[PDB]
Amino acid sequence: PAAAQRPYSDPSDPRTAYFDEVADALERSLKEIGTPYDTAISRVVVDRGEITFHVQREHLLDVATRLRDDPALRFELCLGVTGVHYPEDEGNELHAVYALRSITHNYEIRLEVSCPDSDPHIPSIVSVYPTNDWHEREAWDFFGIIFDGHPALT
């Protein structure tokens, strides 16, 4: 899907109300720890009332940490990663989709990290969200995405 254009929030779809605010807050958190938003997030997509931040694997662990700990984000719930494979998407054929939810601020977003079949590694985020352990494990079983740092790999 094509890159969403600002504003991500749309008046006629309440479901998107907080998208621009969440996006801003995420840019701010990463600047604060010395990471340009554009270097960490490659693309934002808005489809059927859901926002997806396409995150670079290199920076997934930091983004996740910032999403959980920053008071302006506070995503406590990690619904569980899901794998998706695109044979025609050369160099980025293995994707992982993470639905996250913030009860505090009443937000919902998705992260989406990809990696090539030639180097199928995405960092585990069990350190941040323990719940994600089995989901990463299942993503590995079916797709072959190696979740570096996963408890089972020590």
* List of residues contacting Co ion (CB under 5 A): 93, 117
For Co ion, which is the closer residue by CB, 54 or 95? 95
Helix (H) or strand (E) segment spanning residue 111 = strand 107-115
- Distance (Å, whole) CA 115 – CA 79: 21
Question: Alpha-carbon distance 140 to 137, whole Å?
Answer: 5
User: Is 96:82 a contact under the CB 8 Å cutoff?
Assistant: yes
Rank residues 5 and 118 by Cβ distance to Co ion and give the closer one: 118
CB of 83 to Co ion, least distance (A): 11
Sign of the Cα torsion 87, 96, 43, 35 reads negative
Q: Tell me whether residue 11 or residue 88 sits nearer to Co ion (CB atom).
A: 88
Nearest residue to Co ion, by Cβ distance, number only: 117
Cα–Cα distances (Å) from 145 to 36, 93, 106, 111, in that order, read 26, 11, 31, 16
| Residue placing its CB nearer to Co ion in the complex, 14 or 116 | 116
Smaller CB distance to Co ion: residue 108 or 112?
Answer: 112
Q: How far is the CB of 77 from Co ion (least distance, A)?
A: 30
Q: How far is the CB of 97 from Co ion (least distance, A)?
A: 16
How would you classify residue 149: left for phi > 0, otherwise alpha for psi between -120 and 50, otherwise beta? left
Nearest-approach distance from CB 143 to Co ion, in angstroms: 8
Tell me, what DSSP letter sits at residue 6? S
- Smallest gap from Cβ 93 to Co ion, in A, equals 4
